[PDB]
């Protein structure tokens, strides 16, 4: 016989050949999952063969793999988890400290390369014009943090 890694590889290959699961389906069935996954844009370090998702904080690597296969017919060969730090944020400064969410991301290596559709020109799509909200924010800041004779100063926003 042969060693464990090799065996695993063989199993995976067999699964692929079959056109079924390339991993031991857990004998633990959930019928109506409420989980959702966010498909993220790829970083400079990720290849086109890698894609990554924001997944539930309580999501298992195995579970993600399973989920992708069953719901989307996607074979994730290798999966890597990255849990992110929650940074302390506070709004007023008179209000309490608290941490922002611990968020969990997962990179998956697939066989077939994907690339995103190119993001819209800042005009053709109403929503993805990133300027107006920034402007609004700026205006708000001006309104709040102008104290005396800066009330007269002409608006930047």
């Amino acid at each position: 016989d042969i060693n464990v890694s090799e065996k695993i590889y063989k199993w995976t290959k067999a699964g692929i050949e079959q056109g079924k699961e390339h991993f031991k389906v857990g004998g633990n069935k959930v019928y109506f999952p409420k989980a959702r996954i966010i498909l993220l844009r790829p970083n400079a370090k990720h290849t086109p063969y890698q894609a990554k998702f924001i997944v539930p904080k309580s999501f298992n690597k195995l579970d993600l793999r399973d989920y992708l296969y069953h719901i989307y017919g996607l074979r994730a060969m290798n999966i890597t988890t990255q849990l992110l730090h929650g940074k302390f944020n506070r709004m007023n400064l008179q209000t309490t400290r608290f941490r922002e969410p611990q968020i969990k991301k997962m990179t998956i290596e697939m066989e077939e390369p994907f690339i995103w559709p190119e993001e819209p020109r800042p005009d053709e799509n109403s929503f993805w014009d990133s300027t107006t909200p920034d402007n609004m924010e700026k205006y708000r800041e001006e309104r709040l943090n102008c104290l005396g004779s800066d009330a007269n100063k002409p608006g930047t926003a």
């Binding site: 695993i8 590889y9 995976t12 970083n43 400079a44 370090k45 290849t47 060969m77 290596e109």
Partner: protein
């Protein structure tokens, strides 16, 4: 007892005596900094890393041995063990040149980011990988100049090598049987990478 197959630089004679694997060179990515590490074997220790990164700085950090962040990029099969060895040596030389002797020239070819540092996303720098490809190609060319099994470069990813035109279309390569067969994705390519490598070796 202490010195394993990886512990030392291994010449052609040693390989012949042993015959563990076919004559080839392995090239790995650092998957996080974006560095690249060459080797005569599918594994690698600290010593090799040290040899490769003699003069690091904030931009070119001495990378860790972190098992997980070293993923295999290239496996380049040649005809002779000696040839393979030569190629490996050339790669090392190129790396050295890039680092210490002709750093400035190298810099003058990289991509910058307004400030004028080498372009980065986090601590990942794309350019190193590119250099390693280019450098590798150069080394191969040199080897062939110096110079029947047909040579092949097994790629992690078809994407990673620029294009079949422009580069990889030198006459010398054409004259020899330089092939560009991508490795099989099929199973897990990170966890079961060693196994895959072994299989590849067996194939030749």
């Amino acid at each position: 007892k202490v010195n394993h197959s990886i512990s030392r630089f291994r010449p052609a004679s040693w390989f012949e005596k042993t015959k563990i694997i076919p004559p080839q060179v392995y090239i790995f990515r650092n998957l996080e900094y974006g560095q690249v590490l060459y080797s005569q074997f599918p594994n690698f220790s600290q010593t090799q890393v040290d040899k490769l990164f003699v003069r690091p700085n904030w931009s070119n950090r001495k990378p860790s041995l972190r098992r997980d962040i070293w993923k295999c990029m290239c496996v380049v099969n040649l005809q002779n063990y000696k040839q393979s060895v030569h190629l490996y040596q050339n790669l090392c030389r190129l790396r050295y040149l890039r680092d210490v002797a002709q750093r400035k020239e190298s810099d003058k070819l990289r991509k910058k980011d307004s400030n004028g540092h080498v372009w980065y996303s986090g601590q990942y720098r794309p350019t190193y990988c590119q250099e390693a490809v280019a450098d590798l190609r150069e080394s191969l060319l040199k080897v062939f100049e110096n110079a029947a099994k047909k040579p092949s470069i097994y790629w992690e990813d078809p994407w990673r090598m620029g294009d079949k035109d422009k580069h990889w279309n030198y006459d010398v390569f054409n004259a020899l049987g330089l092939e560009h067969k991508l490795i099989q994705r099929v199973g897990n390519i990170a966890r079961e990478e060693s196994v895959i490598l072994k299989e590849l070796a067996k194939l030749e």
